[PDB]
Ligand binder design. Structure first.
Ligand SMILES: O=C(Cc1cccc(Cl)c1)Nc1cncc2c1CCCC2
Ligand SMILES: O=C(Cc1cccc(Cl)c1)Nc1cncc2c1CCCC2
Lengths: 304, 304
């Protein structure tokens, strides 16, 4: 028993991290097979970042201008190209540590682990959720660009995120591994509105089931509700509307605990309307939304 | 910016995990050089665990009874011995993936990453604190025994914890890598009193400095206090007494923010006496104590 914000073991991803330097900028790259992926802003200087013309800036660059280092060995760059906001540096050597991998575009509300890196070296790992507004509330410093988010399915790493920038509000923005930004963000130093965020209802409910599984049952009540009645409460408290698809994904957790989904919805309704009354749930004094129903089942069953 | 419960990259530890089977029990082992370390209760059956005579139980076991598997290759056991509550299985092959390592006995209040494992395979990684009462509030299921806690200093892994058991209260108990239990715990199925726990004051203060560094300054006030006055408050709220040694370790954070340690103590005093008033600090509605002053500086500077 116990419930923690658990990240995937980062080993397979650590073996892919490289340092990419272009001119005076150094950031992280992901070396998979004979290709190194990194944010395209590696080709800019502080003068360029207000409104960069990436096509023009990339034209002034040749293969020999991109310095790629894996630990202490230099990789030879034989090709370079830009795909959306990522650069793809073809190197002459396939990464011997390349794991079985996929590039996936995760959905808002889904979770993933981040391996924060500086100068191609891993510093730490943490679990994140892609916010409904397509930002991530990560922990990143200068030099962290190019650090990636991923999930692991037994031996396969699905890379879902590459870190690009911190918004003036302290939240983080980035791309999928094809270079497409999550959200409306662009890679330039400008004020950028992150949309209105909401709490991931299905994840909060999944976390309430995790609490029941781990002995925390104080919040359970004698009430039930309907999808319609619950959604009126979710509306008032900036929670995502709950659908039958969400109920269906909560099926395994409903079966494990013997607490019907709408009865758990009634517990959530009372917690939203009344607060916690100074009590805690799984060591938290607020409603946690960064655990999916899958994360809860995985952590409560032991999938390796 | 941003602040997360960050674990160390687990790669160096993943390469050490093996499966150890003895009779009908399977748990995890740590393969370092030509030795496999695992909890000694691997030699017991459910009949034995009420009050095991480990010396006698180990006598009925020969090298060939300990089945050690690293992924899919079988290791040949050439020696076995018991050191406190750990078994040391000498194998004929040094682990080629053995990192630079140390065995350390961490102090209560210190933090470390845990790599939860099942059948010698890593499933997840999370950051923990050794509670003042020598328990850890981890996330462990059946088969997790032998999973280890560690810290990483550039290339050196300091192993500090091996998981042994879950107490009837849902908290976790284990040993250092010499087999000595943290706390008064014994490896037998009996009711075992975990002592009164306290909040790690120095860590809460370190986390308040992390909040200031990351823009959360609402809790800062016009007040100061003294070590004596603050310790009276800490006494009432089951917080560890603050000493000049704690003030000294908070020196770097005091210098970074320009907020004197005793002024931060006065903020903590008001938060303890008044609560949060429905507000949050770094995404938490309670006072976090599982970040040391070192963890805060590391996460806020970028040590890899
Ligand atoms: O945001 C950027 C650079 C940048 C500027 C403008 C556009 C783009 Cl795409 C990238 N790097 C960064 C990433 N994550 C965190 C922190 C930083 C830099 C300050 C410290 C925090
Ligand atoms: O506690 C034990 C077995 C055990 C029993 C008595 C003494 C000793 Cl040293 C070890 N294993 C375990 C570890 N962590 C978590 C969970 C479990 C088993 C139930 C599920 C949770």
């Amino acid at each position: 028993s116990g419930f923690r914000k658990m990240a995937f073991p980062s080993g397979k991803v650590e073996g892919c991290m490289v340092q990419v330097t272009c001119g005076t900028t150094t950031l992280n790259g992901l070396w998979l097979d004979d290709v190194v992926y990194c944010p395209r802003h590696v080709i800019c200087t502080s003068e360029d970042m207000l409104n960069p013309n990436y096509e023009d800036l990339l034209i002034r660059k040749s293969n020999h201008n991109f310095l790629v280092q894996a630990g202490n060995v230099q990789l030879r760059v034989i090709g370079h190209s830009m795909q959306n906001c990522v650069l793809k540096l073809k190197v002459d050597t396939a990464n011997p540590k390349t794991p079985k991998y996929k590039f996936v575009r995760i959905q808002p509300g889904q979770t993933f682990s981040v391996l924060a890196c500086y100068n191609g070296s891993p510093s730490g790992v943490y679990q994140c959720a892609m916010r409904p507004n397509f930002t991530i509330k990560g922990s990143f410093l200068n030099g962290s660009c190019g650090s990636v988010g991923f999930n692991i399915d037994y031996d396969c790493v699905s890379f879902c995120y590459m870190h690009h920038m911190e918004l003036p509000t302290g939240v983080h923005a980035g791309t999928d591994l094809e270079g497409n930004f999550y959200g409306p963000f662009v890679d330039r130093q400008t004020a950028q509105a992150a949309g209105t965020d909401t709490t991931i209802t299905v994840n909060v409910l999944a976390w309430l089931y995790a609490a029941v599984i781990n002995g925390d049952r104080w919040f359970l009540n004698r009430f039930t509700t309907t999808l319609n009645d619950f959604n009126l409460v979710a509306m008032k408290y900036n929670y995502e509307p709950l659908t039958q698809d969400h109920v269906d994904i909560l099926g395994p957790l409903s079966a494990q605990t013997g607490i019907a989904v709408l009865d758990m919805c009634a517990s959530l309704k009372e917690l939203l309307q009344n607060g916690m009354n100074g009590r805690t749930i799984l060591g938290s004094a607020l409603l946690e939304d960064e655990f999916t129903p899958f994360d809860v089942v995985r952590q409560c069953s032991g999938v390796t």
